[PDB]
């Protein structure tokens, strides 16, 4: 997903190639950038 | 303290925004009359690239000017851009005007300017200034606003003009009440115009000088 | 557009305001994963090297960009030129462990050893800056350590990187009006 | 379709033009500051990663 | 056939006009992709080489044929014999970047390095001839640059090539009635 | 498609092996050569 | 246009060549690779060629780059014989097609 480009599958299990993530219970700057105001604010003329 | 009367005018790739708006005065009509008549034999064309804002200083409103002090600007005026070159390439043209006049001091100034677009203004008499409001106009009054905006169509005894010999419109700015500065006012106000030709049509292409 | 500038809500105007047209952008080269995922050289110690990403110089692309975040997470790859065999030990190991070969030891094979290593710290994320002493960073902020009879080259490559809370990224300050450089030309 | 983010030592005139900020007039604003910031627009795009010493 | 020769519409007569028979042709060896797609040697500079296809000599098959087009597009492969490690930097990089190893650097592995590189110019196509100064070609017309402690051999191979607008392709001008040569014979 | 002849599929994704083309919005000499007049123009006799 | 009369002989090739940073002598034998037409007095007096915009860039800066060169070449020398015109002046009549502009300049004011 970063800079990787092999089409075939890894020879090693995922549990050996990477650490495994656990859960408890572009996220913020993406939401922030999408919420930007892109309008006008006056009355427009022509 | 300051205001939400907020307008953006866009003419071509140029825009102008004021926050002290008051609105726009449309003079004599809301749209241009027929741009194609018998006098150009279907040879006229629109040149959209000239429809954009150009700028000129008009005068500096100072406390010594009194009622009746005037500044006139005949239109078209010198233009060093594509509208200006149109007048050297075509024998006949017509366009209206979208006019924005600005006088910025601050809200602690007093006094009042009338800005008007007058047709065929071969100069004005003093008593006639009391009736300048017969022409498309707007006031600039510092406690309220800083911008006047007037939009006017092409007018004239002829459907297309020869601007090298006839000027159909004169912008006039008149002091109706003298500027006061008091202790917080700006000490004088420079008046500037931001003007765009509208609907420009040309006909009758000239030779070059080659 | 005008807006209230005191507020901090982002305002992004476009060229459409005066008649242009916003084009399409393809931004995969500024994706964090992608851009952090390449090797960077560090100058090694002769024998014991603790694996600490803050060793990559701050002017490099990876050092510049890692310091533009305050917390990060990644797994790691290292490529090492060394004499002898190379032992790695995880975060929290006694330094003496670096001499016991049952800890991951890679036997010398010319010309270098490339290794994939897991994140091993006891923290849910690590940080490039930490306000405890105020320069020094907690000693648990590392990916373990390596040792060999001599290590000659050490390169780090961040895998699966995540960054949180951006921090200043500074260009060269030009002395003249533009920073001018000789650019590759035929 | 793309331009260079660096400036070549050969390029005496700026290759991409100028931005020009003017004051049309002011009423009693002498000495007041206009502060200016810059941000990326909707279609701004950077491509072709390069590491060139620099900081 | 007679025709109006002033016109420039192509006229292709066949042997059928006098009773022969046109045969079938198989023209895969004059396909542009196919024929541009083979390596050609250039004489290298010792260290910095900017990757510019106009370095291949004009008498070679690939140089002769590249100059027979005015605009072209391709990706590139290079095979390089070098001492040290080889760094490539894309089009538009500062020349100093050629010393930073996070830019694609290939570590020496005998006997040579073969690399696949993308087209990287800011233009939709490049040109073999450009009428700006009238010899010199804009500096953005290149595929980046490479550097190593010494580079000894450099070969270029065009991949996926496209050519637009053909230009003169000249043979040897014989001095006698036929250009005669010793042809490989048992 | 040029001079390439492996039957099996590339190990790397296409996005790494080549640059990717984008679209906006033997082409000319092929059309030109196909349009060539190959007739006669007189009246033919025998 | 090259107007003499039909009693002249000889032949001109007119071609529109892109990026023509000058030409060599042997390359003139292959000028017909470019969009062209001949003018040959026993047949015609006008050559007409229509060509699109070309270049490594979708818009150009004509103050530094000229994409197209019109070239006229004598392929067979003019003959006048007893009734031909004594020489032929060659004139071009050219129209820009599809002109698009972008990036408006300031004035000099």
CB B167 within 8 A of CB B74: yes
Task: Select from B116, B147, B180 the least CA-distant residue to B22.
Answer: B147
Nearest C-alpha in B relative to C16: B13
Resolution of this entry, Å: 2.6
E164 strand-pairing partners: E71
- Measured between its terminal Cα atoms, the distance across chain E in Å is 44
Q: Kindly report the CATH number that applies to the domain delimited by F1-46.
A: 4.10.90.10
CA distances from residue C185 to B152, E138, G44 in whole angstroms, order as listed: 56, 8, 49
Q: In chain G, which residue's Cα lies nearest the Cα of B56?
A: G109
Tell me whether residue A31 is exposed, middle or buried, using C-beta atoms within 10 angstroms of its C-beta: 0 to 12, 13 to 18, 19 or more: exposed
Q: Are C152 and C81 in contact (CB under 8 A)?
A: yes
Quick one: three-class SS letters along chain B?
Answer: CCCCECEEEEECCEEEEECECCCCEECCCCCCCCCCCHHHCCCCEECHHHCCCEEEEEEEECCCCCCCCEEEEEECCCCCCHHHHHHHHEEEEEEEEEEEEEECCCCCCEEEEEEEEEECCCCCCCHHHHHHHHCCEEEECCCCCCEEEEEECCCCCCCCECCCCCCCEEEEEEEEEEEECCCCCCCCEEEEEEEEEEEEEEEEECCCCC
Is G107 within 8 Å of B80 when comparing Cβ atoms? Answer: yes
**Whole-number Å distance between alpha carbons of B57 and B195:** 11
Task: For residues G20 and E54, give the distance between their C-alpha atoms in angstroms, rounded to a whole number.
Answer: 17
Regarding chains D and B, contact by 3 or more CB pairs under 8 A is answered as: yes
Sheet containing C145-147, strands listed edge to edge, beginning at the edge strand earlier in sequence: C48-50, C145-147, C86-89, C105-106
Cα torsion E131, E135, E141, E143 to 10°: value is 160
- Which residue, G71, D1, C37, is CA-closest to E91? D1
**Assigned token pair, C148:** 């060999």
Method: X-ray
Chain mean position to CA D49: 20
**Whether B57 contacts chain G with CB within 8 A:** no
Q: How many residues does chain B have?
A: 210
Report d(CA G50, CA G63) in Å as an integer. Answer: 23
Q: CA-CA distance, G102 to C61, in Å (whole number)?
A: 36
Cα(C162)–Cα(C64) distance, rounded to whole angstroms? 15
Extract the tokens encoding C126: 């690590």
DSSP state of F10: P
Burial class of residue E26 (count of CB atoms within 10 Å of its CB; 0-12, 13-18, 19+): exposed
Torsion angle of the four alpha carbons B83, B149, B171, B199, in this order, in degrees rounded to the nearest 10: 30
Residue partners of F6: CB distance under 8 A and separation at least 6: none
Coil, strand or helix at C11 = strand
Q: At C134, is the secondary structure helix, strand, or coil?
A: coil
* Helix, strand, coil share (%) of chain D residues, nearest 5: 0, 5, 95
Instruction: Please list the helix, strand and coil fractions of chain G in percent, rounded to the nearest 5, in that order.
Output: 5, 25, 65
Gyration radius from chain C CA atoms:
21
Question: Encoding tokens for residue B131?
Answer: 């009736």
Where in chain B are the domains? 1-210
Query: How far apart (Å, rounded) are the C-alpha atoms in residues B81 and F45?
Result: 70
Burial (CB count <10 Å: 0-12, 13-18, 19+), residue C107: exposed
Whether the CB-CB separation of D9 and C180 falls below 8 Å is answered with: yes
The single-letter DSSP state of residue G90 is B
CB contact under 8 A, E10 and F36: yes
Cβ-based neighbour number of residue B7 at 10 Å: 20
Contacts of D27 in chain B (CB under 8 A): 104-106, 109, 146, 186, 189
Residue E92: closest C-alpha in chain D: D4
Q: B107 in the Ramachandran plot: left (φ > 0), alpha (ψ -120 to 50) or beta?
A: alpha
Among residues E55, E62, E59, the alpha carbon closest in space to that of E40 is found at E62
- Distance, in Å, from the CA atom of B44 to the CA atom of G21, rounded to the nearest integer, reads 41
Which stretch of DSSP H or E encloses residue E161?
strand E150-166
Q: Which of E3, E14, E34 comes nearest F3 by C-beta?
A: E34
Q: Tell me how close the Cα of D21 comes to any Cα of chain E, in angstroms.
A: 29
Contacts made by residues D23-29, CB under 8 angstroms, sequence distance 24+: D24/B55, D24/B102, D24/B192, D25/B102, D25/B104, D25/B189, D25/B190, D25/B192, D26/B104, D26/B186, D27/B104, D27/B105, D27/B106, D27/B109, D27/B146, D27/B186, D27/B189, D28/B105, D28/B106, D28/B184, D28/B185, D28/B186, D28/B187
Q: Report angle CA E181, E183, F3 to the nearest 5 degrees.
A: 110
> CB E90 to CB D51 under 8 A?
no
What class has domain C1-186?
mainly beta
Using DSSP, state whether F27 is helix, strand or coil. Answer: helix
Q: What are the structural domain ranges in chain F?
A: 1-46
* Residues found in chain A: 46
Nearest-by-CA chain C residue for E110: C111
C2: left (phi over 0), alpha (psi -120 to 50) or beta: beta
| Burial letters B102-135, b for 16+ CB under 10 A, else e | bbbbbbbbbbbbbbbbbeebeebeeeebeebeeb
Whole-angstrom distance, CA of residue C158 vs CA of residue C74: 6
| Residues listed for chain E | 186
Chain F residues with CB-CB distance to E33 below 8 A:
1-3
Place of tokens 């200083």: B57
Determine the 3-state secondary structure of E84 from DSSP: coil
What is the C-alpha separation between G17 and G33, in angstroms, rounded? Answer: 9
CA distance B107 to chain D (A): 9
- What's the gap in Å between the CA of G109 and the closest CA on chain B? 7
**What dotted CATH number matches B1-210?**
2.60.120.20
Contact B94, B113 (CB under 8 A): no
- Using left for φ > 0, alpha for ψ between -120 and 50, and beta otherwise, residue C147 falls in beta
- Strand C69-83 to B147-152 pairing: unpaired
In chain D, what residues touch B187 (CB-CB under 8 Å)? Answer: 28
Helix (H) or strand (E) holding E61: helix E61-67
**Which residue is closest to B84 within chain G, CA to CA?**
G107
Strands annotated E in E2-57: 40-42, 48-50
- With a CB cutoff of 8 Å and minimum separation 6, the contacts of C32 are C161, C162, C163
């Amino acid at each position: 997903s970063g800079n990787t480009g092999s089409i075939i599958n890894n020879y090693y299990m995922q549990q050996y190639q990477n650490s495994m993530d656990t859960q408890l219970g572009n996220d913020w700057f993406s939401k922030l950038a999408s919420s930007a105001f892109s309008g006008l604010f006056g009355a427009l003329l022509a | 303290l300051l205001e939400d009367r907020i307008l953006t005018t866009r003419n071509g790739h140029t825009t102008s925004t004021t926050q002290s708006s008051v609105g726009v005065t449309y003079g004599y009509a809301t749209a241009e009359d027929f741009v194609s008549g018998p006098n150009t034999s279907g040879l006229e064309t629109r040149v959209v690239q000239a429809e954009r804002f150009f700028k000129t200083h008009l005068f500096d409103w100072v406390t010594s000017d009194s009622f009746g002090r005037c500044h006139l600007l005949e239109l078209p005026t010198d233009h060093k851009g594509v509208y200006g070159s149109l007048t050297d390439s075509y024998a006949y043209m017509r366009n209206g005007w979208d006019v924005e006049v600005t006088a910025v001091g601050n809200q602690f100034n007093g006094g009042c300017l009338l800005v008007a677009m007058v047709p065929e203004l071969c100069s004005i008499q003093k008593r006639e200034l009391y009736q300048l409001t017969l022409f498309p106009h707007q006031f600039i009054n510092p406690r309220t606003n800083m911008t006047a905006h007037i939009t006017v169509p092409f007018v004239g005894v002829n459907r297309y003009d020869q601007y090298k010999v006839h000027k159909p419109w004169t912008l006039v700015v008149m002091v109706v009440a003298p500027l006061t500065v008091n202790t917080e006012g700006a000490p004088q106000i420079k008046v500037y115009a931001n003007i765009a030709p509208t609907n420009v049509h040309v006909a009758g292409e000239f030779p070059s000088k080659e | 557009t005008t807006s209230a500038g005191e507020s901090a809500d982002p305002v992004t105007t476009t060229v459409e305001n005066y008649g242009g047209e916003t084009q399409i952008q393809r931004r995969q080269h500024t994706d964090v994963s992608f851009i952090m995922d390449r090797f960077v050289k560090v100058t090694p110690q002769n024998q014991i090297n603790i694996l600490d990403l803050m060793q990559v110089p701050s002017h490099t692309l990876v050092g510049g960009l890692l310091r533009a975040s305050t917390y990060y997470f990644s797994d790691l790859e290292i490529a090492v030129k060394h004499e002898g065999d190379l032992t790695w030990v995880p975060n929290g190991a006694p330094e003496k462990a670096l001499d016991n070969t049952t800890n991951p030891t890679a036997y010398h094979k010319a010309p270098l050893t490339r290794l994939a290593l897991p994140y091993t710290a006891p923290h849910r994320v690590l940080a490039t800056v930490y306000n405890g002493e105020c320069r020094t960073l907690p000693t648990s902020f590392n990916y373990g350590a390596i040792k060999a009879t001599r290590v000659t080259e050490l390169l780090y490559r961040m895998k699966r990187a995540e960054t949180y809370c951006p921090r200043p990224l500074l260009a060269i300050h030009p002395t003249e009006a533009r920073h001018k450089q000789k650019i590759v030309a035929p | 379709d793309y331009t260079y983010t660096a400036s070549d030592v050969a390029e005496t005139t700026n290759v991409q033009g100028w931005v020009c900020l003017f004051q049309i007039t002011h009423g009693k604003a002498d000495g007041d500051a206009l502060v200016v910031l810059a941000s990326a627009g909707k279609d701004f795009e950077l491509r072709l990663p390069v590491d060139a010493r620099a900081e």
